[PDB]
Amino acid sequence: SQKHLQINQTFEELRLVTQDTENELKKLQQTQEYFIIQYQESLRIQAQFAQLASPQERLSRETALQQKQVSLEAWLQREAQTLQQYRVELAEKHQKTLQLLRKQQTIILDDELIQWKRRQQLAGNGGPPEGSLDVLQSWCEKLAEIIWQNRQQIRRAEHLCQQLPIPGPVEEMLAEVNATITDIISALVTSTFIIEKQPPQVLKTQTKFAATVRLLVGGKLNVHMNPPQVKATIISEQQAKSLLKNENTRNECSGEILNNCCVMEYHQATGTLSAHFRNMSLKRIKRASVTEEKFTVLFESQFSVGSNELVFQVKTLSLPVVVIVHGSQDHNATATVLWDNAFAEPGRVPFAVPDKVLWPQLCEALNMKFKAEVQSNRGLTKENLVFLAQKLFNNSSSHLEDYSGLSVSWSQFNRENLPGWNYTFWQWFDGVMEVLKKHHKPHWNDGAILGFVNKQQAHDLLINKPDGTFLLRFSDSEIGGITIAWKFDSPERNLWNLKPFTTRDFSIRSLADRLGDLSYLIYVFPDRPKDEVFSKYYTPVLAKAVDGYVKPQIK
Ligand SMILES: CN(C)C(=O)CCN(C(=O)[C@@H]1CCCN1C(=O)[C@@H](NC(=O)c1cc2cc(C(F)(F)P(=O)(O)O)ccc2s1)C(C)(C)C)c1ccc2scnc2c1
C-alpha cells in the first residue's frame, strides 16, 4: 500500500516504546522494594546497638556498626532521589508515548475510518463498495492493546507512589497522564461502534430488513467476554439532532421495530465482534413532504471495559432513511437519499445538505446511480450529460464546459417542474432509469438504445441515411417513454417519430417483438441490421398444452 506503511511503522514504534516503559517500571519496582528492605536494615542498626551486653569486643563492634550506619544513611538518601528521578523519567516517557498514540489514533479514526464511511455512503448511490473492515479492525486492535498496556503500567506506577510517597511534580504528571488515557479510551470506544451494513435507505413499512453493527475493539478489550445487547430504534432527524447536542429526553423515538435487540457474537480466527440484526421490521412510523422526511436507525449499547467502574454508552446513527408505506413513493424517496449520500459535508449536523451544487457534481451522482440502476458499465457519456444539461437549464449549448460553473438547487432538481412540463428533472431522469431497468437492461448494455438525443438531433442524424434507418430515443412528453425516430422518404414526410411506448405497452408486447413487427424499421442507427441487434430477443412462440401439444414445441 502507500500511507498504510507509515501507519504500520508508527505501530511498531509504539510497541517498542511501550515495551521500554514496561522494562523501566519492573526496574523501578525492584529499586523501591530493595530500598524498603535497606530502610529496615537501618532500623536493624539501632536494635544491634542494644545487643552488646559485650566486654572489649563492644568497642570494635560499635565502631563498625556506626560506620555501617553512616554509609547506609548516605545510600538511603541518594536512593530516595534516584526513586524520585526514575518516577519523573517514567512519567515523561508515558507522556511521549501517549502523544505519538494520539496522533496515530487521529489518523485511524478521523482519516481512514471517515474515508471508509464516505465510501459506504457513496455506495448507497451506486458507488464502488467500501470493502472489508479487516485492516481497520487490525489497526483498532493495536490502538486498544497499546492504550490498555500503557494504562495498566501507569496504574502500577501510581500504586508504587501510594505505597512510598515522595511529594513533588510526579503527582501532577500522573494526573495529566490519567486525563490523557481517559480521553484516548473514550474516543476509541465511541468511534469504533460502527454500522458495517446499513439498513435500506428507502425503507418500506412492514418489510423485513437487516443491519450489521460491529465494535472494532471488542476482541482486544474486555467486551467479547460479556457481549452486549445492541438496541435499534427509529428516530427522526430532529430527535437525531437533539441527541447529538446531548439535549434529548433519553427515550424519544418515532416508531417501533420488531426484533430490534441483538447480542454481539464473537468470531474467533477473525477477532470480529458484531451484532447481525437479520429480521428487523418497521411496525409503525410516527410523522411530524413525507418523501423528503429523514429518519435514522439509532444503535445503542452499554458495556464495560475490564472494570466495573469503566462503563461506556455507545451510540451510532445509520445513514438517513426515508420511510415509505406504498411503494409508489420509492421514486421521490430515492431523490432525497441520492442528494444526501452525494452531497453530505464532513462533520455536518444530523442530516443537513447543501441547497445547491455545481452541475459537474450532480453529473457524477447521476452517472453513478444510472450505472447501478441499469447494471451496466455503459453510463452517461459527455454527449448524454450535455443533453441532460440542456433539459435541466433550458439552454441550447452543446458544449459541456458551458455548464461547469452553473448551479442546480434542490428545487430545480426535484421540486419545480421543467419549462413546459408537469414533471421535475428527477422525475424525468428516474422515468428513464425505471423503463430501462424494468425491460431493457440487455438492450441498453448492447448499445441498441441511443436514448439521450432530442427530436431535432434524431432528425439531423437520420436525414441522409438509407430508408428504414431508426434510433430509440427517450420521450420528452411522457415519463418512462421510449419513442422510435426513423427516416423513410414519402410525399407527406421523410423524418418520422412514433408515439412513445411505456412500461404498460412493453408488458403486453416487448420492445424487440414490436420492432420485429415493423417492417419499415430496417437499420438501427448508424447501419446495424435490425435482426443482428434484436433477434436474440424475439419471442419464439410456444405452443400450449391446452391445445394438445404433449411436448414443448415452437410454432
Ligand atoms: C397501433 N399499433 C398496434 C401500433 O403499435 C402502431 C404504431 N402506433 C401508431 O401508429 C400511433 C397511433 C396513433 C398515431 N401513431 C403514431 O405513431 C404517429 N405519431 C404520433 O402519434 C406521435 C408521435 C409522438 C412523439 C413524441 C416524442 F417525440 F416522443 P416527445 O419527445 O415526447 O416529443 C411524443 C408524442 C407523440 S404522438 C405517427 C407515426 C405519425 C403515425 C403506436 C405507437 C405507440 C403506441 S403506445 C400505444 N399504442 C401505440 C400505437
Gap from CA of 504 to ligand 1 centroid (Å): 14
Amino acid at 61: R
Please tell me if the CB atom of residue 498 comes closer than 6 angstroms to any atom of ligand 1: yes
Residue for cell digits 545487643?
Answer: 51
Index of the ligand 1 atom closest to the CA of residue 505: 46
Gap from CA of 488 to ligand 1 centroid (Å): 16
Index of the ligand 1 atom closest to the CA of residue 481: 29
Identify the bridge partners of residue 24 per DSSP, sorted by sequence position. Answer: none
Is the distance from CB of 372 to CB of 128 less than 8 angstroms? no
**Helix, strand, or coil (residue 160):** helix
Residue for cell digits 515523561?
Answer: 92
Give CA–CA dist 388/394, Å, rounded.
10
Q: Name which residue sits closest to atom 50 of ligand 1, judged by CA.
A: 499
Gap from CA of 390 to ligand 1 centroid (Å): 24
DSSP string, 84-149: HHHHHHHHHHHHHHHHHHHHHHHHIIIIIHHHHHHHHHHHTTTPPP---SHHHHHHHHHHHHHHHH
Write out 28-56 in H/E/C secondary structure. Answer: HHHHHHHHHHHHHHHHHHHHHHCCCCCCC
Reported resolution, Å? 2.4
Is the distance from CB of 35 to CB of 83 less than 8 angstroms? yes
Please tell me if the CB atom of residue 454 comes closer than 6 angstroms to any atom of ligand 1: no
Q: Name which residue sits closest to atom 13 of ligand 1, judged by CA.
A: 499
Residue for cell digits 437487516?
Answer: 210
What grid cell was written down for 474? 427517450
**DSSP strands (E only) in 369-459:** 407-409
**Could you give phi then psi for residue 264, rounded to 5 degrees?**
-65, 135
Residue for cell digits 438496541?
Answer: 231
Give CA–CA dist 469/459, Å, rounded.
11
Is the distance from CB of 489 to CB of 511 less than 8 angstroms? no
Q: Under 8 Å CB-to-CB from 260, ≥6 apart: which residues? A: 231, 232, 233, 277, 280
Considering only CA atoms, which of 281, 276, 253, 254 is closest in space to residue 266?
A: 276
CA distances from 91 to 99, 149, 151, 287, 479 (A): 12, 14, 12, 55, 71
Q: Under 8 Å CB-to-CB from 439, ≥6 apart: which residues? A: 503, 506, 510, 511
- The alpha carbons of the chain give a radius of gyration, in whole angstroms, of 37
Amino acid at 184: I
Exposure string over 485-502, b if 16+ CB within 10 A, otherwise e = bbbbeeeeeebbebebbe
Q: Which of 387, 499, 507, 511 to mutate to test the pocket of ligand 1 (most atoms within 8 A of CB)?
A: 499
Gap from CA of 498 to ligand 1 centroid (Å): 4
Please tell me if the CB atom of residue 500 comes closer than 6 angstroms to any atom of ligand 1: yes
Gap from CA of 507 to ligand 1 centroid (Å): 17
Identify the bridge partners of residue 244 per DSSP, sorted by sequence position. Answer: none
Note if the bond before 354 is cis, omega within 30 degrees.
no
Gap from CA of 501 to ligand 1 centroid (Å): 8
Q: Under 8 Å CB-to-CB from 460, ≥6 apart: which residues? A: none
Give CA–CA dist 306/308, Å, rounded.
7
Index of the ligand 1 atom closest to the CA of residue 483: 29
Angle between helices 134-163 and 3-49 (to 10 degrees): 20
Please tell me if the CB atom of residue 505 comes closer than 6 angstroms to any atom of ligand 1: yes
Is the distance from CB of 410 to CB of 339 less than 8 angstroms? yes
> Vertex 392, ends 388 and 394: CA angle to 5°?
110
Give CA–CA dist 184/166, Å, rounded.
28
What grid cell was written down for 178? 490519567
Please tell me if the CB atom of residue 513 comes closer than 6 angstroms to any atom of ligand 1: no
Please tell me if the CB atom of residue 518 comes closer than 6 angstroms to any atom of ligand 1: no
Q: What is the dihedral of CA 368, 370, 374, 376, to 10 degrees?
A: -40
> Vertex 96, ends 91 and 97: CA angle to 5°?
95
**DSSP strands (E only) in 179-223:** 193-197, 202-204, 208-215
Amino acid at 504: R
Considering only CA atoms, which of 475, 482, 470 is closest in space to residue 436?
A: 482
Amino acid at 417: N
Please tell me if the CB atom of residue 499 comes closer than 6 angstroms to any atom of ligand 1: yes
Please tell me if the CB atom of residue 475 comes closer than 6 angstroms to any atom of ligand 1: yes
What grid cell was written down for 348? 455536518
Gap from CA of 370 to ligand 1 centroid (Å): 27
Identify the bridge partners of residue 314 per DSSP, sorted by sequence position. Answer: 301
